[PDB]
Structure 1
Amino acid sequence: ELLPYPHQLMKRLLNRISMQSQLIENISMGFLDMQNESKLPLLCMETELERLKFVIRSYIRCR
């Protein structure tokens, strides 16, 4: 049977998934303008948000 939707924590991180998407939004663009080096810190940040974004994608569909 259905369980109570814990809305309080969800919106608390739903702000967070907006923020780091905007954090990488500028800092890539700052890396393009400084390009006339390290390709580590971009790729990890790109995959980490969407994996958490993947989890709630299933989580609301089963509702």
Structure 2
Amino acid sequence: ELLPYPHQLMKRLLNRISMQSQLIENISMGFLDMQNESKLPLLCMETELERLKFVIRSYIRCR
């Protein structure tokens, strides 16, 4: 049977998934303008948000 939707924590991180998407939004663009080096810190940040974004994608569909 259905369980109580814990809305309080969800919106608390739903702000967070907006923020780091905007954090990488500028800092890539700052890396393009400084390009006339390290390709580590971009790729990890790109995959980490969407994996958490993947989890709630299933989580609301089963509702």
State the TM bucket, normalised to the shorter chain. over 0.9
RMSD over aligned CA atoms reads 0.0
Alignment of 1:1-63 (within 5 A): 1-63=1-63
Give the TM-score normalised by structure 1: 1.00
Instruction: Provide structure 2 residue ranges, at least 5 long, that are not aligned to the other structure.
Output: none
Cα-to-partner distance string for 1:16-47 (whole Å, 9 max, x where unaligned): 00000000000000000000000000000000
| Structure 1 stretches of at least 4 aligned residues deviating more than 2 Å after TM superposition | none
| Sequence identity percentage | 100
Equivalent residues, number:
63
Instruction: Provide structure 1 residue ranges, at least 5 long, that are not aligned to the other structure.
Output: none
2: CA distance between counterparts of 1:16 and 1:59? 17
Shift, 1:8, TM fit: 0.0
